[PDB]
Amino acid sequence: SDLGKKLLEAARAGQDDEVRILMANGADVNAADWLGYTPLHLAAWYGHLEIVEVLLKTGADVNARDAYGITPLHLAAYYGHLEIVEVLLKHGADVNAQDKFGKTPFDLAIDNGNEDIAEVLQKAA
Amino acid sequence: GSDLGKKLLEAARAGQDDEVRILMANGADVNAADWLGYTPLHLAAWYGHLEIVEVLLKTGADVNARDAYGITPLHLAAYYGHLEIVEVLLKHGADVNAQDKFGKTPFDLAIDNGNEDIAEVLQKAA
Amino acid sequence: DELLYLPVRGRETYEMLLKIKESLELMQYLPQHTIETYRQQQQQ
Amino acid sequence: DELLYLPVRGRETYEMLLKIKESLELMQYLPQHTIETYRQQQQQQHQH
Amino acid sequence: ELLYLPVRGRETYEMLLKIKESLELMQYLPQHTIETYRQQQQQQHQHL
Amino acid sequence: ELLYLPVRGRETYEMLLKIKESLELMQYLPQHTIETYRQQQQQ
C-alpha cells in the first residue's frame, strides 16, 4: 500500500518513531516490495535493532523469503548485525533456511568473515 | 559508376553463358567481387555452370580467389557436388590444400557433404 | 548436473556472453508475476 | 543513464533484444548480496 | 518490420547494437558458411 | 582462444547459443567487410 511502502522505507532508513506511527495507522507489518522484501528484512539488513523488535512484536513473519529465498536472518548474518541475529533466533528464525543459491545464514556469515555470528548460528544449528 | 562487374557476378550465378561473354568483350572485370569476396568464378563453381567456369579461367579469373571466409571456387564445386567443375579447376591450378577459416580443404567439404566421388578425385589430385 | 557448457572462441565474445548469461540466469529465479509487473512500465 | 533508441528490423530479433535488455535493466535493481552470492556460487562451481 | 527499442546506457546500447548487427548479418551469409560453422562446432563439442 | 561458459537452464542456453553463433560468424569478417555491409544497409 501507500502505508506499506512508507513502512518499507521507514524500516530501511531506521526511522523508529515513523515505524510506530505507520503501525498505529494500520500499516501492514508484512507489506512486501516487488522482490518480497518485508519491513523486517530491511531492518535486519540495515541493522535497526529497535525496529526489528517492534516489527516482531506486531506480527512480522520472522522467516519471510524474498524472490531469491533470502530471510531476515540471512541479511543480519551477511551484514554483520549480531544482536539482530540473536533476536531473530529467539523469535524462531530458521537457522537451516537455504536461499535459492543453497546458502544458509551460517554460509553468508562465513562468506563475509563474520566469525562471531557464524559461531552463534553453528551452536543454534 | 560501372555496373559491369555487378552484371557479370549476376550472369555467372544465373548461368547466362552468352551474357558473360558479352560482358567481358565489353571490358567487365573478370575478377569483380561482391561484399563477401565472391567472384564470378566462385558463383559459377557454386551453381554448377561449367561453360562459364571455362570462359572465366580462359579470361584470367583467379582460380584460388578467397571469399571473406577463405572459401575458393574448388571448395564450392566440392561442397555443391559439381565433379566436372572440380576437374576443370584442378587442371587450371586450383589449390587442393586451400583451407577456409574453419580449417576445411575442398576434400573435407566433399566428405562432410557425402560427395565421395569428388573426394576421391581430390585425394588423388594430392 | 543440469549445467550445459557452451564453447566460445575469443575473450571479447566470451565476456559479452558472460554478462548476458548472468542477467538471464538471475532473471530466471523470479516468478512470472514479478517480471510481468516490470514489463508494464515498458509497454507504457 | 542516457536514454538511447536502437532501430530493429524483425519481430524475432526485437523480442530477443527486448528479453536481454530487460534482464540487464532488472539486474541493476537486485541487491548487492544477491549479485555477490550468485557470482561466488559461479566461482565455487568453476573450481569443480 | 521497423521497431524501436529504448535502451538506458551507452554500454548496454553498444552491446545490443553488436548483437543486432551479428544477427542481421547472418541472414545474408551463404548456407555453406553457416553449415560448415555448425558442423565444426559439433566436431569440437564431441572432442570436448 | 577456446573458452567454456557454464549455463543453467535450456532457455538461457538456446538464447546464448543463437547469439554465440551470430557473433562468432561476424568475428571472422575483416573490419572493411563489416564497414561495407553497414554502408550498404544505410542505403
Numbering used by the authors:
A (entry chain F): 2 to 126
B (entry chain E): 1 to 126
C (entry chain C): 359 to 402
D (entry chain A): 359 to 406
E (entry chain B): 360 to 407
F (entry chain D): 360 to 402
The authors write:
Here we describe the characterization of Designed Ankyrin Repeat Proteins (DARPins) that were selected as tight binders against all folded domains of p63. For the initial development of DARPins as tools to study the p53 protein family we have focused on p63. This transcription factor is involved in the proliferation and differentiation of epithelial tissues as well as in genetic quality control in female germ cells.
The tetramerization domain of p63 differs from the oligomerization domain of p53 by the presence of a second α-helix per monomer that reaches across the tetramerization interface and thus stabilizes the tetramer. DARPins were generated against the complete tetramerization domain including the second α-helix. After initial selection screens, the identified DARPin 8F1 was further characterized by ITC measurements showing a KD value of 54 nM. The crystal structure of DARPin 8F1 in complex with the tetramerization domain revealed a 2:1 DARPin:TD ratio, consistent with the stoichiometry observed in ITC, with each DARPin binding to the hinge region connecting helix 1 and helix 2 of two monomers. Because these two hinge regions are part of the tetramerization interface this structure predicted that only tetrameric but not dimeric conformations of p63 should interact with this DARPin. As expected, the DARPin did not bind to the stable dimeric isoforms TAp63α, TA*p63α, and GTAp63α but did bind to the tetrameric isoforms TAp63γ and ΔNp63α. Consistently with the pulldown and ITC data, DARPin 8F1 does not bind dimeric p63 isoforms but does bind tetrameric ΔNp63α. Intriguingly, our findings thus demonstrated that DARPin 8F1 represents a conformation-specific binder for tetrameric p63 isoforms. For the TD and the SAM domain, the high selectivity of the p63-only binding DARPins 8F1 and A5 was confirmed. DARPin G4 and the SAM domain-specific DARPin A5 showed a strong pulldown signal for p63 while the tetramer-specific DARPin 8F1 showed no pulldown signal at all, consistent with the fact that oocytes only contain dimeric TAp63α.
